Amino acid sequence: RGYSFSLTTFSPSGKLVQIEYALAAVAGGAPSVGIKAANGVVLATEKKQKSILYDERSVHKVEPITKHIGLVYSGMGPDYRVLVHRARKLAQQYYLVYQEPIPTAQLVQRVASVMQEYTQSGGVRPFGVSLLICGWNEGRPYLFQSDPSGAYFAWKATAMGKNYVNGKTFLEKRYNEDLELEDAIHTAILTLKESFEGQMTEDNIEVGICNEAGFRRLTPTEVKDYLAAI
Amino acid sequence: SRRYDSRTTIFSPEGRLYQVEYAMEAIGHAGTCLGILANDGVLLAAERRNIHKLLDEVFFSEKIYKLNEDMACSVAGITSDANVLTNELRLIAQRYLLQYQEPIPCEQLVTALCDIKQAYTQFGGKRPFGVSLLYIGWDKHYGFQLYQSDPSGNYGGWKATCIGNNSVSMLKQDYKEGEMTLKSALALAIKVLNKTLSAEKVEIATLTRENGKTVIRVLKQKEVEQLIKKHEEE
Amino acid sequence: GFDRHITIFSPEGRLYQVEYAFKAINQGGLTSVAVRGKDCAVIVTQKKVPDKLLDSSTVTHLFKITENIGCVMTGMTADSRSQVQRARYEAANWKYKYGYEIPVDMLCKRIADISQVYTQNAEMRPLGCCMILIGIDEEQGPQVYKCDPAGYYCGFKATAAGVKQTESTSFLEKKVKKKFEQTVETAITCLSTVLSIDFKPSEIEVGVVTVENPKFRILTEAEIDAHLVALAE
Amino acid sequence: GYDLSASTFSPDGRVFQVEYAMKAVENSSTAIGIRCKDGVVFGVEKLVLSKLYEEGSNKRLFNVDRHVGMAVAGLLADARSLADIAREEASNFRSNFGYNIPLKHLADRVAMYVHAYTLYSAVRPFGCSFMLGSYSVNDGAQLYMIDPSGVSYGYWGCAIGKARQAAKTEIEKLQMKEMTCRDIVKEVAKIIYIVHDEAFELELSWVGELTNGRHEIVPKDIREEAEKYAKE
Amino acid sequence: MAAAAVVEFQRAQSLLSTDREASIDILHSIVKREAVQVKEQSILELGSLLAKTGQAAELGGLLKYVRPFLNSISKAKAARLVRSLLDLFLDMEAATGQEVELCLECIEWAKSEKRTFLRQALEARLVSLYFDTKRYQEALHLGSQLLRELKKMDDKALLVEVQLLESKTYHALSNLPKARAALTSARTTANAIYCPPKLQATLD
Amino acid sequence: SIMSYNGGAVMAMKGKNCVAIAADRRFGIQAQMVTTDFQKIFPMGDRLYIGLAGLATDVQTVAQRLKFRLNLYELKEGRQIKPYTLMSMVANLLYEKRFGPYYTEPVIAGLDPKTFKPFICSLDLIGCPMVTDDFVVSGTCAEQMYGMCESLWEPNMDPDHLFETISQAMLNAVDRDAVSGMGVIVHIIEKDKITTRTLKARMD
Amino acid sequence: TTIAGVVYKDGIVLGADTRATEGMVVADKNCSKIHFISPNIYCCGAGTAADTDMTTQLISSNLELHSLSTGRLPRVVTANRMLKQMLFRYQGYIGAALVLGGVDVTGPHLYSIYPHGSTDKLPYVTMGSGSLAAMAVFEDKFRPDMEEEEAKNLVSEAIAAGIFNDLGSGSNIDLCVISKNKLDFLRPYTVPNKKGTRLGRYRCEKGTTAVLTEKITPLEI
Amino acid sequence: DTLDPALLRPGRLDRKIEFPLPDRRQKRLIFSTITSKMNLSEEVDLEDYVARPDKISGADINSICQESGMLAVRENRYIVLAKDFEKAYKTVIKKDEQEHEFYK
Numbered sequence A: 001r002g003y004s005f006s007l008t009t010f011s012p013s014g015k016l017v018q019i020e021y022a023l024a025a026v027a028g029g030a031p032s033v034g035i036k037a038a039n040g041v042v043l044a045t046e047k048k049q050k051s052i053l054y055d056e057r058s059v060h061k062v063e064p065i066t067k068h069i070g071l072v073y074s075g076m077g078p079d080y081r082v083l084v085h086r087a088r089k090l091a092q093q094y095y096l097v098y099q100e101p102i103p104t105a106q107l108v109q110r111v112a113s114v115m116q117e118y119t120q121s122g123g124v125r126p127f128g129v130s131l132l133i134c135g136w137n138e139g140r141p142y143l144f145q146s147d148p149s150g151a152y153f154a155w156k157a158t159a160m161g162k163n164y165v166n167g168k169t170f171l172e173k174r175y176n177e178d179l180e181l182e183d184a185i186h187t188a189i190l191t192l193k194e195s196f197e198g199q200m201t202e203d204n205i206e207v208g209i210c211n212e213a214g215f216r217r218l219t220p221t222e223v224k225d226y227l228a229a230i
Numbered sequence B: 001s002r003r004y005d006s007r008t009t010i011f012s013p014e015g016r017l018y019q020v021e022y023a024m025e026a027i028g029h030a031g032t033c034l035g036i037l038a039n040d041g042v043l044l045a046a047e048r049r050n051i052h053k054l055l056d057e058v059f060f061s062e063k064i065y066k067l068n069e070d071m072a073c074s075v076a077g078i079t080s081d082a083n084v085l086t087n088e089l090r091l092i093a094q095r096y097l098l099q100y101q102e103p104i105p106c107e108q109l110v111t112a113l114c115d116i117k118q119a120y121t122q123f124g125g126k127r128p129f130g131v132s133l134l135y136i137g138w139d140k141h142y143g144f145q146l147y148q149s150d151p152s153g154n155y156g157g158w159k160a161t162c163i164g165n166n167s168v169s170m171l172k173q174d175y176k177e178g179e180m181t182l183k184s185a186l187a188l189a190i191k192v193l194n195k196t197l198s199a200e201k202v203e204i205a206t207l208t209r210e211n212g213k214t215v216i217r218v219l220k221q222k223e224v225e226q227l228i229k230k231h232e233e234e
Numbered sequence C: 001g002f003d004r005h006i007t008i009f010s011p012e013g014r015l016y017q018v019e020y021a022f023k024a025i026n027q028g029g030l031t032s033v034a035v036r037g038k039d040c041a042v043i044v045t046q047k048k049v050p051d052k053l054l055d056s057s058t059v060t061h062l063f064k065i066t067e068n069i070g071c072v073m074t075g076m077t078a079d080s081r082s083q084v085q086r087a088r089y090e091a092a093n094w095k096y097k098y099g100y101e102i103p104v105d106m107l108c109k110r111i112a113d114i115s116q117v118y119t120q121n122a123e124m125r126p127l128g129c130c131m132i133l134i135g136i137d138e139e140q141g142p143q144v145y146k147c148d149p150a151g152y153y154c155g156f157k158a159t160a161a162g163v164k165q166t167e168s169t170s171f172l173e174k175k176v177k178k179k180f181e182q183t184v185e186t187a188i189t190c191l192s193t194v195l196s197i198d199f200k201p202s203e204i205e206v207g208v209v210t211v212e213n214p215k216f217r218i219l220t221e222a223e224i225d226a227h228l229v230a231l232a233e
Numbered sequence D: 001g002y003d004l005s006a007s008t009f010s011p012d013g014r015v016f017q018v019e020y021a022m023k024a025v026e027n028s029s030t031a032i033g034i035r036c037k038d039g040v041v042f043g044v045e046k047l048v049l050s051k052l053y054e055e056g057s058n059k060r061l062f063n064v065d066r067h068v069g070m071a072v073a074g075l076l077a078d079a080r081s082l083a084d085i086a087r088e089e090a091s092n093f094r095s096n097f098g099y100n101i102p103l104k105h106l107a108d109r110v111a112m113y114v115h116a117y118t119l120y121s122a123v124r125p126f127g128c129s130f131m132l133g134s135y136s137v138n139d140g141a142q143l144y145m146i147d148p149s150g151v152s153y154g155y156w157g158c159a160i161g162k163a164r165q166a167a168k169t170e171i172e173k174l175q176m177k178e179m180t181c182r183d184i185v186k187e188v189a190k191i192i193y194i195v196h197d198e199a200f201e202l203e204l205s206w207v208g209e210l211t212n213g214r215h216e217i218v219p220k221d222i223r224e225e226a227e228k229y230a231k232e
Numbered sequence E: 001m002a003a004a005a006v007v008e009f010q011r012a013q014s015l016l017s018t019d020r021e022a023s024i025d026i027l028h029s030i031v032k033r034e035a036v037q038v039k040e041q042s043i044l045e046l047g048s049l050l051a052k053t054g055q056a057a058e059l060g061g062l063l064k065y066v067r068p069f070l071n072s073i074s075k076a077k078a079a080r081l082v083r084s085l086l087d088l089f090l091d092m093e094a095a096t097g098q099e100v101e102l103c104l105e106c107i108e109w110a111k112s113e114k115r116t117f118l119r120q121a122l123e124a125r126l127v128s129l130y131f132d133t134k135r136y137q138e139a140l141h142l143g144s145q146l147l148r149e150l151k152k153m154d155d156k157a158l159l160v161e162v163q164l165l166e167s168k169t170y171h172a173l174s175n176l177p178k179a180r181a182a183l184t185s186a187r188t189t190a191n192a193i194y195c196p197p198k199l200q201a202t203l204d
Numbered sequence F: 001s002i003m004s005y006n007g008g009a010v011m012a013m014k015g016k017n018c019v020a021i022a023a024d025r026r027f028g029i030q031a032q033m034v035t036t037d038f039q040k041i042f043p044m045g046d047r048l049y050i051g052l053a054g055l056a057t058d059v060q061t062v063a064q065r066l067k068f069r070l071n072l073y074e075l076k077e078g079r080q081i082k083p084y085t086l087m088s089m090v091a092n093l094l095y096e097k098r099f100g101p102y103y104t105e106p107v108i109a110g111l112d113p114k115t116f117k118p119f120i121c122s123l124d125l126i127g128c129p130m131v132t133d134d135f136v137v138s139g140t141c142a143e144q145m146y147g148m149c150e151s152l153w154e155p156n157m158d159p160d161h162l163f164e165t166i167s168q169a170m171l172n173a174v175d176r177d178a179v180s181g182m183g184v185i186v187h188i189i190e191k192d193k194i195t196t197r198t199l200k201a202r203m204d
Numbered sequence G: 001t002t003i004a005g006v007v008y009k010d011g012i013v014l015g016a017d018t019r020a021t022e023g024m025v026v027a028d029k030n031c032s033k034i035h036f037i038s039p040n041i042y043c044c045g046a047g048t049a050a051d052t053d054m055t056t057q058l059i060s061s062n063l064e065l066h067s068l069s070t071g072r073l074p075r076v077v078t079a080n081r082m083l084k085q086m087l088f089r090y091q092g093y094i095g096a097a098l099v100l101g102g103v104d105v106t107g108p109h110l111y112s113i114y115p116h117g118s119t120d121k122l123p124y125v126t127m128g129s130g131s132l133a134a135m136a137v138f139e140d141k142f143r144p145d146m147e148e149e150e151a152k153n154l155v156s157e158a159i160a161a162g163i164f165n166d167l168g169s170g171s172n173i174d175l176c177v178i179s180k181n182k183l184d185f186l187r188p189y190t191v192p193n194k195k196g197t198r199l200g201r202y203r204c205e206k207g208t209t210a211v212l213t214e215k216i217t218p219l220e221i
Numbered sequence H: 001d002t003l004d005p006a007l008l009r010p011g012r013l014d015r016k017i018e019f020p021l022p023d024r025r026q027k028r029l030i031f032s033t034i035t036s037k038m039n040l041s042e043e044v045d046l047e048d049y050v051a052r053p054d055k056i057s058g059a060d061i062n063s064i065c066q067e068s069g070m071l072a073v074r075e076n077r078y079i080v081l082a083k084d085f086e087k088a089y090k091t092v093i094k095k096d097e098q099e100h101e102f103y104k
Helices: A017-027 A077-098 A104-114 A164-173 A183-192 A220-228 B018-029 B079-100 B106-122 B182-195 B221-227 C018-022 C077-097 C104-118 C165-174 C187-194 C221-229 D016-026 D076-097 D103-116 D164-173 D182-195 E035-053 E056-063 E076-091 E099-112 E116-132 E139-152 E159-171 E181-188 E197-203 F056-076 F083-094 F159-175 G049-070 G077-088 G131-138 G148-163 H024-036 H059-072 H083-092
Strands: A032-037 A040-046 A157-160 B034-036 B043-046 B071-074 B134-138 B144-149 B155-157 B203-210 B213-217 C032-037 C040-046 C069-073 C131-136 C142-147 C204-210 D031-036 D039-044 D061-063 D069-072 D144-146 D152-154 D203-207 F009-014 F019-024 F041-043 F048-051 F107-111 F118-122 F130-132 F135-139 F184-189 F193-199 G003-007 G012-017 G020-022 G025-028 G041-043 G098-102 G109-113 G119-122 G173-178 G183-190 G211-218
Touching: A032 A164, A032 A183, A040 A183, A077 A104, A077 C104, A077 F083, A077 G049, A104 B079, A157 A164, A164 A183, A183 A220, A183 E116, A220 E076, B034 B182, B043 B071, B043 B182, B071 B079, B079 B106, B079 F056, B106 B134, B106 B144, B106 B155, B134 B203, B182 B203, B182 B221, C032 C069, C032 C131, C032 C142, C032 C187, C040 C069, C040 C131, C040 C142, C040 C187, C069 C077, C069 C204, C077 C104, C077 C131, C077 D103, C077 G077, C104 C131, C104 C142, C131 C204, C165 C187, C165 H083, C187 C204, C204 C221, D031 D069, D031 D164, D031 D182, D039 D069, D039 D182, D061 D203, D069 D076, D076 D103, D103 D144, D103 D152, D164 D182, D182 D203, E035 E056, E035 E076, E056 E076, E056 E099, E076 E099, E076 E116, E099 E116, E116 E139, E116 E159, E139 E159, E159 E181, E159 E197, F009 F048, F009 F107, F009 F118, F009 F159, F019 F041, F019 F048, F019 F107, F019 F118, F019 F159, F041 F056, F048 F083, F056 F083, F083 F107, F083 F118, F107 F135, F107 F184, F118 F135, F130 F135, F130 G025, F159 F184, F159 F193, G003 G098, G003 G109, G003 G131, G003 G148, G012 G098, G012 G109, G012 G148, G041 G049, G041 G077, G041 G173, G049 G077, G049 G098, G077 G098, G077 G109, G077 G119, G131 G148, G148 G173, G148 G183, H024 H059, H059 H083
Parallel strands: none
Antiparallel strands: A032 A040, A032 A157, B034 B043, B043 B203, B071 B134, B134 B144, B144 B155, B203 B213, C032 C040, C040 C204, C069 C131, C131 C142, D031 D039, D039 D203, D061 D069, D144 D152, F009 F019, F009 F135, F019 F184, F041 F048, F048 F107, F107 F118, F118 F130, F184 F193, F193 G211, G003 G012, G012 G173, G020 G025, G041 G098, G098 G109, G109 G119, G173 G183
């Protein structure tokens, strides 16, 4: 049982062939924006299903890691769910040994640590989910993104998934360092509104904020509320 | 199956290692951060990723990592691997303390990390750690010293060697081996980085001391705007 | 190299094993359509005996996970019973480990997750069967779920599974935008309008759950025969 | 080259190491099993190579738990292997739960054993179709048949082997439900002598009310009574 | 909630479509005495009913509009409430001197909750307000205030429309310091967005 | 017993923004004093001292083990350690070796690294957090260091009064003991200083 | 340790005295014995002072991982069964006689966990030594289906009856009231035990010390 | 894609006109024209099937609208109301593609 040989390896050019394919599988994923704001963040994403047939209260893409840290993805479906499982477990190891909710930076350390050995270690392919992190952690909010390589960077705004160059350029245009509450939600909504493939339905987007009282998903009556206030 | 393995731990017919010198070409794609020692302490001088505004604050950067009170390390190549190994080697440092109550003279640490990284290129069938990271440090035995290692496994005392692209030959026409006077080592560092520049797109960090205990400074913002106007010509 | 051999990333993403495993669930094809009632999650599927030499009672899809969760699967029937036995295992393991009987959603999350670790590690094929599985909890209404061989459970109203999936979900989408405990014009009529057999009560298996009686019940030719002669409107 | 490994699908979803094992029992002799109301009667074709092999040189009607049987088709090494671990499986059931093993659970258990053995490149699939069969005092004459794919179905008159294309027709035209097994022991020879189209030194075993949940090679008298169905 | 905080709660459900005159100032008894969507839709459909009869949405709208009022009414309900209510203040009015300060209270009010985009929303509708009542002097000036923020932000997101409006203000009186420059400049920034035929045909 | 092997006695008490931790400089076998200098107050942070008592191989063992895991923690996430978190970390150091435990009761004395709100804690053998705002006591001669220092400690004390009272509590506490004493040590932790001092005791 | 808990029409009322006495001397005069597990489940604790802490950090962490895995609020039956099965396989070496209670989607109910792993659904429980001092006041004046205020008064009279005639007494009573909609974890409910007062000041200033060697070290700069 | 790289070179062509396979702000105009030359009974909706914007030419707009009318010839109808529109569209309203869940 098992293989115990790495399938991720170095090209003759000198680069990882599987990781750039993982960033291709991320770049073919659903678009998701994340905006660091002066008191709190907003992590919006786009839930377009096949038909109007499914339960849009069944699966989530905003979902917390146990205290005040939500994380949203773009790319492969269930590999995300594995990273939520591992991330909740690592946050609870940290909580049972140090008796505080985990600093966001350390959670990104350990999630980027567990995503690294799937670029090695016996036949496993890398995850191909570049999920991004939020978190209030004391004083000022944080935001990160763990690539399927294992790198991570903190910033003020980003996008990912489909056509993310337009998201990074557009958020580079419209960002202010004091831009703080629901205005961030506003520009997040008009970053997903940029493509969306049509009509901007409230059941096809969900956002999550970290407004100094724990990460919480937004109820579907609140997104449609600001979709009435467009 | 034996049809599927990449077979990393195989000698070439020319005798070399295919997966090892592919890591050496991974350094030349992304890599900066020279290091200069003096009679006084040692400094790294580094480059960030690009001009992309969208970057709020790094406590330490993604380049310079603290290891003890008297050591630090900088990183080239693939940044996902080395993070792991630097936490790995950080463990090594602390357990030497647990075994000896000494602040781990840095050649012990570089030898240990190069032994485990050699162990990943020796067997196990995995890919080697694609990072030619280097180290600065001090011990009571020797002076201020920096070491430099690579994904092959060997290392050395490499008094002014840089890593990454555009390869150090100018430094081996400019470094005075006897005395260096660390302010002029900063001047030579911004010379080399000025040929290869405020702290939006540079990351320079020094190691000095006061009254015996070492001080690792990351050279906060306005010092870089001092040294960048310390030129006219160069 | 081995993009279409190993569960690894090809160029442009698109790992070429899960859609090779999706094409495995269309092999032969005995086809389930699941109907949900604001109070009754009925189950429908078609089942064809080859030669009147099989025991028709023994051939089924229609398995029972527990006293509240039933399931039906349309994949290759070799990979079916290896998947339903682990679902029974995690149901009884949930009831031994966490007290109450497992609700229907995270059962499908969990078998979706072991199907994920099939399609994450190499040296194992992602087994080709998808689990239409229904069930009722105390809080919400009846639910229905389907984890694919990639591990992407959704939370459905009315999909289908097997050969002729697209015609079935097109018929259900055209026949749900109008607004059904009896489910007489929805459940069987998806099959009889997709593939046009207008069944006698042998070849169809129906498994209901009701809010008034949450025990999973597989129906027989008497009550499904009254259910079929109720298609005379 | 999408072949040669059981962990790799076809581009239309068809694991070729299973269907190559399926023809690997289609190049081996027949073994028919006929259910009736007092039990299940097996009958296996033998393809005796030389005179050097004696009577029962290779058993192909094994038994497992003092009541279920093992009419096998394919590779006798693999069939003998899963026969003895079926013996160990009913051993763990009788030792574990006390109650004598119902056959549906044994067929599902050995079925998922040989199925879960076809999910890995580190093993080959089995190359042996085989069938079971018994009855408890309140079970009915349960028999099941298991492919190398691992699928197990309840049958009435299943037939595996080379000439199962011929053998399924006569078992279908034979009156299936209501006769009292002794005649069908006799009638089994008519199926075996029809499907053998070329020493055919056949062998029979059953479970029935003359046995009370057991197995016997015939006892030995129908071997000189069902031999008298030559010239048909 | 007191005893008379929810006493007439159903009155903003039946009288939404009972008659166009049975809730002229009658729902105002709800407004200035569950209750957050009944109260918000009471202001929205009371204000829409009085913006159907014609006048009392800004009169009794002023009677409800002093605003030492809201902080935590599910804040985007304040966005939609202030947005559509000020849309009923703008879209139709009766006394011409009113709506100048009705939207000005919304500008300095939009400074209070720090909603940046709602400011330039009501500044577009506010330069549009000053042009309709023939102010002609400082709609100019607030149009010069609006382009300073638009320039900082994505170019001409709405300052195609505001620049069109201040371009309408000059031709009432003025000359070439606008005529070709600001209009053609609005056209140069008008070929780089999703243009509806309202804005693009109005620019035509 | 086995806690009465090496003696040892530490305590800690706080008034105003200073704390005061104090040990007895003594080490040896039940009757014998093999040395006088013996480190019991181990510095971990700049202003967070842990003090240990009981069996001496356990106080050096989990003192160095705690410097290992603490030092690696503040290396993994760059900041000075919050002292409540260090209480949790010795709580999950003495525990998880519950079976055959360490024979020590470490007290933890110090300041929050950004608000300078002092506290002091104590733990048992297998590790239980006793957060305390008054004073904690560890060692063989426990109830003396209780008892008396519960009879002395008033709230809200400046460092010279706290200085004086932990001096008297230590001297008259360990004087009334056989296997402890012989010169004690007092660390005052202010918000700018560490007044480290020794005390000439009844050294007999 | 005297502990207790009573179910009533809306919910449950736990309660404990706050004193931990190692040996025959109080080590700490004010400690919480009503431990968090969940926003709808509080447990309690008696026996070993550290083992209750670690077993409810473990079941608290594992349980809220479970609850945010399910998404819904966690039930109180699974806390009972995780404490039962995890506390059983250590053969009773953990001495944690804890009770736990909860309001959930079925109904408000509480369990008791003996340190060997035996669980009891009861309307009213008492662990610790003060069980005996607080069980009789659940046998003269306990009534089923009783209103919240005299249930709070009941549990305060029970723990207060574990104060006055037990040597595992406490300083002051804290008790939590877990209802359907609101949780009320209130620290100390009544303090029937004041400190008293001192008489006469004691110290001089910069005297009464035998200083042998000072040493001063600055910190900031 | 294979025309010739010497057929342009600023002298033989000097131009290039992309034809877009149209989208949202254009698709509406195509439906408005092709329906504007038919018989409609206003049970139809316009922007509902401008919605789902998925990979159409103008030729298949003429196919689903022409097919809508011809599917209305079944009941010998001189108009089209509800199903022939939706009906033909779904039938050949791109006879689907092949999604592909997980990624996306």
